[PDB]
Amino acid sequence: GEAIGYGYQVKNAKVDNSTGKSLTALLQLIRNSPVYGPDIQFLSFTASFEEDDTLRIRITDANNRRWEIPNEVLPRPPPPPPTTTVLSHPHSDLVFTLFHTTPFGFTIYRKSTHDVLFDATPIPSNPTTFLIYKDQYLQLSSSLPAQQAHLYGLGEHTKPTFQLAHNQILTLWNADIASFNRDLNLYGSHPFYMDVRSSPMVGSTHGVFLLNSNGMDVEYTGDRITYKVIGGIIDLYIFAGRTPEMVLDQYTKLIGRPAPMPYWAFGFHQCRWGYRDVNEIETVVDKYAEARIPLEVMWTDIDYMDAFKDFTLDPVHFPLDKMQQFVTKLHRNGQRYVPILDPGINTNKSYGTFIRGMQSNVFIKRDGNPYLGSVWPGPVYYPDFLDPAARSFWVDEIKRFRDILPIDGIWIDMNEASNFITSAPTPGSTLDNPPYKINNSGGRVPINSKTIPATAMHYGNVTEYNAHNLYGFLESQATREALVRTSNERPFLLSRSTFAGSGKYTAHWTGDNAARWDDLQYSIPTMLNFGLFGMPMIGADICGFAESTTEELCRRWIQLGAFYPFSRDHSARDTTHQELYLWESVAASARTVLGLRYQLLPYYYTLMYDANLRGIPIARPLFFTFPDDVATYGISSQFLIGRGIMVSPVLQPGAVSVNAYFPRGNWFSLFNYTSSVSVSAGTYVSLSAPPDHINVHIHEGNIVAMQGEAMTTQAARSTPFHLLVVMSDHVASTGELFLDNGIEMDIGGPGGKWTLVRFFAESGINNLTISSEVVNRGYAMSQRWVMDKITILGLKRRVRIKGFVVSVISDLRQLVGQAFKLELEFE
Ligand SMILES: C[C@H]1O[C@H](O[C@H]2[C@H](O)[C@@H](O)[C@@H](O[C@H]3[C@H](O)[C@@H](O)[C@@H](O[C@H]4[C@H](O)[C@@H](O)[C@@H](O)O[C@@H]4CO)O[C@@H]3CO)O[C@@H]2CO)[C@H](O)[C@@H](O)[C@@H]1N[C@H]1C=C(CO)[C@@H](O)[C@H](O)[C@H]1O
Ligand SMILES: *[C@@H]1O[C@H](CO)[C@@H](O[C@@H]2O[C@H](CO)[C@@H](O)[C@H](O)[C@H]2NC(C)=O)[C@H](O[C@@H]2O[C@@H](C)[C@@H](O)[C@@H](O)[C@@H]2O)[C@H]1NC(C)=O
Numbered sequence: 030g031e032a033i034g035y036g037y038q039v040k041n042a043k044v045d046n047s048t049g050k051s052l053t054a055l056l057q058l059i060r061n062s063p064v065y066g067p068d069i070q071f072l073s074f075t076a077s078f079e080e081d082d083t084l085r086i087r088i089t090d091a092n093n094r095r096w097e098i099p100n101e102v103l104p105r106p107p108p109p110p111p112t113t114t115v116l117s118h119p120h121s122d123l124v125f126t127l128f129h130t131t132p133f134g135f136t137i138y139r140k141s142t143h144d145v146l147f148d149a150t151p152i153p154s155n156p157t158t159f160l161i162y163k164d165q166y167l168q169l170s171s172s173l174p175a176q177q178a179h180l181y182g183l184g185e186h187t188k189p190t191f192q193l194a195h196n197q198i199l200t201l202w203n204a205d206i207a208s209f210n211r212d213l214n215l216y217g218s219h220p221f222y223m224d225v226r227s228s229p230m231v232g233s234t235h236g237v238f239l240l241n242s243n244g245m246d247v248e249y250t251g252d253r254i255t256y257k258v259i260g261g262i263i264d265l266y267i268f269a270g271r272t273p274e275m276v277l278d279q280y281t282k283l284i285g286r287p288a289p290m291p292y293w294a295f296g297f298h299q300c301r302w303g304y305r306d307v308n309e310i311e312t313v314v315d316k317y318a319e320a321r322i323p324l325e326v327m328w329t330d331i332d333y334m335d336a337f338k339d340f341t342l343d344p345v346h347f348p349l350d351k352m353q354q355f356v357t358k359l360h361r362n363g364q365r366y367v368p369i370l371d372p373g374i375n376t377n378k379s380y381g382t383f384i385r386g387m388q389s390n391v392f393i394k395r396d397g398n399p400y401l402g403s404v405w406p407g408p409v410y411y412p413d414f415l416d417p418a419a420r421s422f423w424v425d426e427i428k429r430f431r432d433i434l435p436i437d438g439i440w441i442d443m444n445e446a447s448n449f450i451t452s453a454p455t456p457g458s459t460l461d462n463p464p465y466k467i468n469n470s471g472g473r474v475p476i477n478s479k480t481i482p483a484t485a486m487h488y489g490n491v492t493e494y495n496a497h498n499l500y501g502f503l504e505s506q507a508t509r510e511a512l513v514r515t516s517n518e519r520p521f522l523l524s525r526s527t528f529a530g531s532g533k534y535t536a537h538w539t540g541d542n543a544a545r546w547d548d549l550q551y552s553i554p555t556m557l558n559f560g561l562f563g564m565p566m567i568g569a570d571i572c573g574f575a576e577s578t579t580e581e582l583c584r585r586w587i588q589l590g591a592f593y594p595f596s597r598d599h600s601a602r603d604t605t606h607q608e609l610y611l612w613e614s615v616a617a618s619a620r621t622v623l624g625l626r627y628q629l630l631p632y633y634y635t636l637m638y639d640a641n642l643r644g645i646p647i648a649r650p651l652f653f654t655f656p657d658d659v660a661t662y663g664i665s666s667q668f669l670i671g672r673g674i675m676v677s678p679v680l681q682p683g684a685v686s687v688n689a690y691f692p693r694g695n696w697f698s699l700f701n702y703t704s705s706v707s708v709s710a711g712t713y714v715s716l717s718a719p720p721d722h723i724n725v726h727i728h729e730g731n732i733v734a735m736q737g738e739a740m741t742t743q744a745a746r747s748t749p750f751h752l753l754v755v756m757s758d759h760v761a762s763t764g765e766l767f768l769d770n771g772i773e774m775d776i777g778g779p780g781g782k783w784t785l786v787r788f789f790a791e792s793g794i795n796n797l798t799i800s801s802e803v804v805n806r807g808y809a810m811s812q813r814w815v816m817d818k819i820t821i822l823g824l825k826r827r828v829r830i831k832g833f834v835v836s837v838i839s840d841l842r843q844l845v846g847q848a849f850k851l852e853l854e855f856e
């Protein structure tokens with residue numbers, strides 16, 4: 030009945046000289062244990078500053094290379110070449126200390142406040158606190174200040190709170206498990222957390238990322254967090270912050286900046302599993318138009334395929350000629366089309382894709398032969414997306430399909446990879462039967478369950494055991510590559526399975542949620558989480574994927590979902606239909622809220638630009654704007670779009686009001702500028718929320734450029750700009766507008782076919798000035814964009830050109846590309 034492990038001692042350690050300081054230590058195992066398998070006797074330990082704001086701690090086997098995420102998959106700077114050894118840099122707020130105890134320890138603290146960020150000092154009689162390092166069990170633990178540390182992240186899991194609750198285990202093992210299930214490991218793995226400290230120095234935030242693709246359990250008990258990882262190495266990154274936005278900037282610098290999205294992807298999307306034929310999807314499109322509900326993109330689920338085979342069309346229900354006609358008509362109406370692809374290729378002798386796949390040997394193998402799964406068409410082989418040959422095959426299959434049927438984007442699903450059967454384990458393999466069982470599906474379920482077995486092999490003799498969590502991520506890279514090679518437009522793809530870095534390639538949606546009030550709320554923490562994960566294009570299936578929706582739930586869901594960065598109504602086939610036009614109350618709400626969303630299109634687009642530039646999420650937690658307000662840390666039912674717009678949805682059946690938190694200051698309803706909330710300090714306010722209404726407020730100190738409502742994003746972009754200026758007594762109001770053609774591949778690139786406008790507004794005693802600065806005037810000028818109206822909120826006196834009131838300045842006819850300074854006088 031042994032102890033789990035006995036820990037390590039420092040045998041030597043030095044800080045290098047004359048270079049960007051790094052520390053190298055050699056660690057020797059104290060004593061062996063049989064628990065969880067063979068202990069690595071010698072460890073190479075390094076701490077180094079890859080940037081002034083980013084500390085990297087890398088623990089490897091001193092005597093053997095171990096699995097690491099390939100640099101080609103996630104490119105990053107290479108590794109560097111009692112008694113304590115201390116590492117610190119003059120311009121870094123991070124200080125690293127190696128404790129030569131028995132067993133050894135290490136900490137990282139803030140120079141500026143002495144707050145301990147990460148504390149891996151062992152409690153010597155408590156092996157659960159030790160660094161343990163076995164071939165299939167790595168243990169790394171940090172103490173935390175229970176009440177000061179507020180943690181977020183470690184996806185993908187459905188949770189009723191955004192801030193991680195104390196006393197839980199979060200399992201990371203990509204699995205086809207429905208997101209309507211709380212707690213369970215879902216489709217993606219993001220071993221990142223944000224840690225917002227309420228003191229010392231309120232709002233002081235850092236990030237912690239373990240760059241490891243193996244299955245893991247992360248145990249969080251409030252005063253401790255422990256990683257239990259079944260392979261690979263410890264490659265840990267600490268991001269200094271100190272604001273939450275800085276942390277995401279630092280994190281996305283490492284894992285990849287969010288891919289831009291095309292302008293059209295912010296329009297409304299409609300999909301259903303079960304659409305019967307071309308006539309039905311044409312009918313859906315028509316009825317959206319007839320209801321005057323904006324619809325941008327029509328999607329087809331696996332119904333369109335011939336017997337669920339990728340790259341085919343059902344000759345009876347979705348014939349090529351009628352589908353070609355249908356897509357052409359979409360395109361003539363300013364609309365777009367996105368079909369689904371699964372990764373498994375049906376083992377069918379008449380099937381061209383299968384033939385070319387076999388000819389190029391593109392499939393993942395087990396025991397020397399292609400691994401046989403079961404998915405929608407039955408038997409399948411899975412392309413090895415780690416194999417360059419398979420990626421070329423994928424590009425080719427997509428090019429062939431695109432040649433016959435125009436598409437505007439791709440939805441990649443089932444890519445955990447999902448398998449409908451579980452294969453028998455390889456006798457004697459500790460990969461198929463690992464010594465430590467992670468909490469797969471909340472029941473310590475074997476990792477091979479409903480996926481590709483761990484003993485399957487990939488390109489370069491890589492085991493599925495090691496590469497499993499990378500599959501969806503790899504398919505996303507290959508698919509974005511295929512789209513970029515077959516069209517010069519900025520591509521759009523949506524992926525189910527993801528890993529840290531996936532945001533550089535793809536949007537994500539929350540997966541198989543349910544038509545439940547619980548899931549309506551769950552969409553908010555998941556939306557916020559994916560922003561932290563560097564995947565700002567996130568949304569949930571509006572009205573619920575699984576189970577039949579109700580009129581009321583669907584009405585409250587479109588109200589909320591109209592503000593997701595990715596807004597799509599999708600549903601399972603064994604449920605009632607849930608297109609937005611089916612109920613009048615839903616249709617009316619849809620027009621109102623999609624109306625406002627569409628007016629906000631230039632704003633969403635600008636946020637998408639900021640996200641690609643800095644990693645800052647489009648939909649962000651309140652504490653991103655108000656990190657000094659501790660009350661916002663625990664909020665899980667409100668969120669911001671950009672800096673100053675707050676969405677506060679009703680999330681309860683039968684409710685006609687919502688208790689919503691308002692940070693200090695003046696907030697104005699975007700649906701009625703006369704309606705406002707003014708609070709001298711942050712507090713809950715019981716907002717009226719009639720059946721047809723959702724609360725959406727803008728804070729003082731912000732300026733938002735809007736365009737008009739329209740049925741398509743193209744038509745919306747042809748309308749005048751109206752500037753909404755919300756004055757603050759305390760600060761000048763500012764805002765930003767990024768403009769390009771909506772589809773440029775290199776957003777904000779040196780070609781300069783874009784413009785960036787900054788808006789400013791400041792009150793004097795007797796006057797008010799509103800002005801803009803323009804980058805690349807000639808370009809914006811060439812696009813004829815006109816700002817015709819400015820609405821001024823936040824003041825108690827009316828204003829004119831040479832309780833709160835609203836002032837509107839009309840008929841300006843101002844070119845957006847020409848900087849202006851507008852001077853106003855108080856009445
Ligand atoms: C459409 C959908 O179909 C598959 O998923 C189904 C699944 O086959 C159903 O059996 C059902 O599974 C639930 C199960 O009923 C529920 O009890 C729960 O099981 C828990 C269990 O409760 C708990 O005790 C513990 O044991 O863990 C279990 C889970 O591990 O949860 C199950 C699901 O995890 O519902 C799901 C979801 O409907 C298939 O696997 C899905 O991928 C598939 N969805 C895909 C397919 C599409 C068609 O192309 C798309 O339309 C869709 O967007 C895409 O996500
Ligand atoms: C190989 O491709 C065939 C042609 O697409 C598949 O047959 C088709 O399956 C449909 C059910 O999804 C069925 O409605 C079609 O009538 C049928 N077409 C023909 C020409 O037979 C075939 O699918 C298998 O066979 C059918 C009869 C069903 O039993 C499916 O469940 C089977 O998977 C494909 N073969 C395989 C092994 O997938």
Ligand SMILES: *[C@@H]1O[C@H](CO)[C@@H](O[C@@H]2O[C@H](CO)[C@@H](O)[C@H](O)[C@H]2NC(C)=O)[C@H](O[C@@H]2O[C@@H](C)[C@@H](O)[C@@H](O)[C@@H]2O)[C@H]1NC(C)=O
Binds near residue numbers: 701702703704
């Ligand atoms: C926008 O919000 C305003 C603030 O609640 C509404 O004004 C209010 O209207 C009430 C009558 O419905 C009235 O008792 C309140 O005193 C009044 N409050 C203020 C500050 O004016 C406004 O409601 C009206 O809109 C239409 C329906 C007309 O009745 C106008 O006279 C009001 O401005 C809200 N606007 C809309 C369009 O709902």
